[PDB]
Scaffold this active site. Structure first.
Site, short mmCIF file in Angstrom:
data_model
loop_
_atom_site.label_atom_id
_atom_site.label_comp_id
_atom_site.label_asym_id
_atom_site.label_seq_id
_atom_site.Cartn_x
_atom_site.Cartn_y
_atom_site.Cartn_z
N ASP A 181 -166.32 6.17 -26.76
CA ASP A 181 -166.92 7.11 -26.21
C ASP A 181 -166.00 7.57 -25.15
O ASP A 181 -166.07 8.78 -24.83
CB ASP A 181 -168.26 6.49 -25.71
CG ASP A 181 -169.58 7.17 -26.57
OD1 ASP A 181 -169.34 7.53 -27.81
OD2 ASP A 181 -170.58 7.07 -26.13
N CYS A 215 -162.71 17.54 -34.65
CA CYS A 215 -163.50 16.28 -33.63
C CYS A 215 -164.57 17.13 -33.02
O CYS A 215 -165.38 17.77 -33.80
CB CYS A 215 -162.57 15.65 -32.84
SG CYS A 215 -161.23 16.63 -31.97
N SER A 216 -164.87 17.02 -31.70
CA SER A 216 -165.68 17.86 -31.17
C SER A 216 -165.10 19.42 -30.87
O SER A 216 -165.91 20.49 -31.31
CB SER A 216 -166.54 17.44 -29.69
OG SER A 216 -167.63 18.20 -29.32
N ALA A 217 -163.97 19.29 -30.00
CA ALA A 217 -163.50 20.91 -29.78
C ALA A 217 -162.36 20.83 -30.79
O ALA A 217 -162.12 22.18 -30.77
CB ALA A 217 -162.87 20.65 -28.20
N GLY A 218 -161.98 20.10 -31.67
CA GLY A 218 -160.71 20.24 -32.46
C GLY A 218 -159.68 20.22 -31.95
O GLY A 218 -158.49 21.15 -32.39
N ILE A 219 -159.27 19.85 -30.83
CA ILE A 219 -157.93 19.74 -30.09
C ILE A 219 -157.28 18.33 -29.62
O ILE A 219 -156.28 18.18 -29.55
CB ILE A 219 -157.90 20.65 -29.03
CG1 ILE A 219 -158.99 20.40 -27.85
CG2 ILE A 219 -158.00 22.30 -29.42
CD1 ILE A 219 -158.73 21.21 -26.49
N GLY A 220 -158.21 17.44 -29.55
CA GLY A 220 -157.74 16.14 -28.67
C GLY A 220 -157.51 14.95 -29.70
O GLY A 220 -156.37 14.88 -30.11
N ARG A 221 -158.34 14.28 -30.29
CA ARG A 221 -158.51 13.52 -31.27
C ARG A 221 -157.76 14.00 -32.58
O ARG A 221 -156.80 13.66 -33.37
CB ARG A 221 -159.55 12.78 -31.92
CG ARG A 221 -160.36 12.12 -30.39
CD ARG A 221 -161.74 11.56 -30.97
NE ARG A 221 -162.64 11.17 -29.86
CZ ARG A 221 -163.76 10.69 -29.97
NH1 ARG A 221 -164.56 10.71 -30.96
NH2 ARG A 221 -164.30 10.52 -28.74
N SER A 222 -158.11 15.51 -32.91
CA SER A 222 -157.67 16.15 -34.07
C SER A 222 -156.10 16.40 -33.90
O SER A 222 -155.34 16.36 -35.04
CB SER A 222 -158.23 17.54 -34.01
OG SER A 222 -159.63 17.33 -34.73
N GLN A 262 -155.34 16.22 -25.18
CA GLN A 262 -156.17 16.68 -23.97
C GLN A 262 -156.04 15.80 -22.68
O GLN A 262 -156.57 16.34 -21.64
CB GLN A 262 -157.69 16.40 -24.35
CG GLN A 262 -158.17 17.61 -25.10
CD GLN A 262 -159.80 17.53 -25.17
OE1 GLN A 262 -160.25 16.84 -26.03
NE2 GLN A 262 -160.48 18.70 -24.58
#
Length: 284
Positions: A181, A215-222, A262
């Site tokens: 998390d 992912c949620s925003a599509g920039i960090g984990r993605s 991010q």
């Protein structure tokens, strides 16, 4: 410079935040005028994360062609990816329309539906074989065919049917379920194992449309997923693998979608993942 030495140098000097801010300063700025039109406000999860106009995916409909999704086209590595936000209640039909129209074989999901006690994306696939989903706005049917639950990820087989033509296709859903998390994982071992399972399925290969990753925003984990994959492929292809410069690859990817990676912690984790993954690419 061998990234493994660059890594220890940054780590001993504790300058990760400085490196990361340099990347933020040099990153491309291109217009995103379509994303900001008033009619698209309920198609965006976050006000400050938008696709650039020049690389956005267009839906094939005359009404409103907008979705929060970008095509990342890596020319030397010969790989393409679609990076998108986690679907919203009002965009689940658009999401599966894009999968259909772009001829994708796989969907890669790097978040849980609820994290930190809040919803991070809609429940956009069916959880039981006998309870299929119908998306009336885009005329698609989606059925759960099988599910394989492992300790660190789940893989699902899905059937997508275009109800207009009665064509069907098999889509593979690769769901990494154990990103914490807060922060990043302590070891990259399970994330790399997951990447190799996606590769083994064919979902990243040129006989199919681009993989869809979110992912949620599509920039960090993605961003971590595609950055690691592309760097490992370049180390395979080049005569001198130590010539692969992860900061330069990240800046190339940021020509196609804003904000990839991010935090400084995500940048360090990306380095760690490529360094450990290379100890298979080369031949070990």
């Amino acid at each position: 410079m061998e990234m493994e030495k660059e890594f220890e140098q940054i780590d001993k000097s504790g300058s990760w935040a400085a490196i990361y801010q340099d990347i933020r300063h040099e990153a491309s700025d291109f217009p995103s005028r379509v994303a900001k039109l008033p009619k698209n406000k309920n198609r965006n999860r976050y006000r400050d994360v938008s696709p650039f106009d020049h690389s956005r995916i267009k839906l094939h409909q005359e009404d409103n062609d907008y979705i929060n999704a970008s095509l990342i086209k890596m020319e030397e590595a010969q790989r393409s990816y679609i990076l998108t936000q986690g679907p919203l209640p009002n965009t689940v039909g658009h999401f599966w329309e894009m999968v259909w129209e772009q001829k994708s074989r796989g969907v890669v999901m790097l978040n849980r539906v609820m994290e930190k006690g809040s919803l991070k994306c809609a429940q956009y696939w069916p959880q039981k074989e006998e309870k299929e989903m119908i998306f009336e706005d885009t005329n698609l049917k989606l059925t759960l065919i099988s599910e394989d639950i492992k300790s660190y990820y789940t893989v699902r087989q899905l059937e997508l049917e275009n109800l207009t033509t009665q064509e069907t296709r098999e889509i593979l859903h690769f769901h990494y379920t154990t990103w914490p998390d807060f922060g990043v994982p302590e070891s990259p071992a399970s994330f790399l194992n997951f990447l190799f399972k996606v590769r083994e399925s064919g979902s990243l290969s040129p006989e199919h449309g681009p993989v869809v990753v979110h992912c949620s925003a599509g920039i960090g984990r993605s961003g971590t997923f595609c950055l690691a994959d592309t760097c490992l492929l370049l180390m395979d292809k080049r005569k001198d693998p130590s010539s692969v410069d992860i900061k330069k690859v990240l800046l190339e990817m940021r020509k196609f979608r804003m904000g990839l990676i991010q935090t400084a912690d995500q940048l360090r984790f990306s380095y760690l993942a490529v360094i450990e993954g290379a100890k298979f690419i080369m031949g070990d």
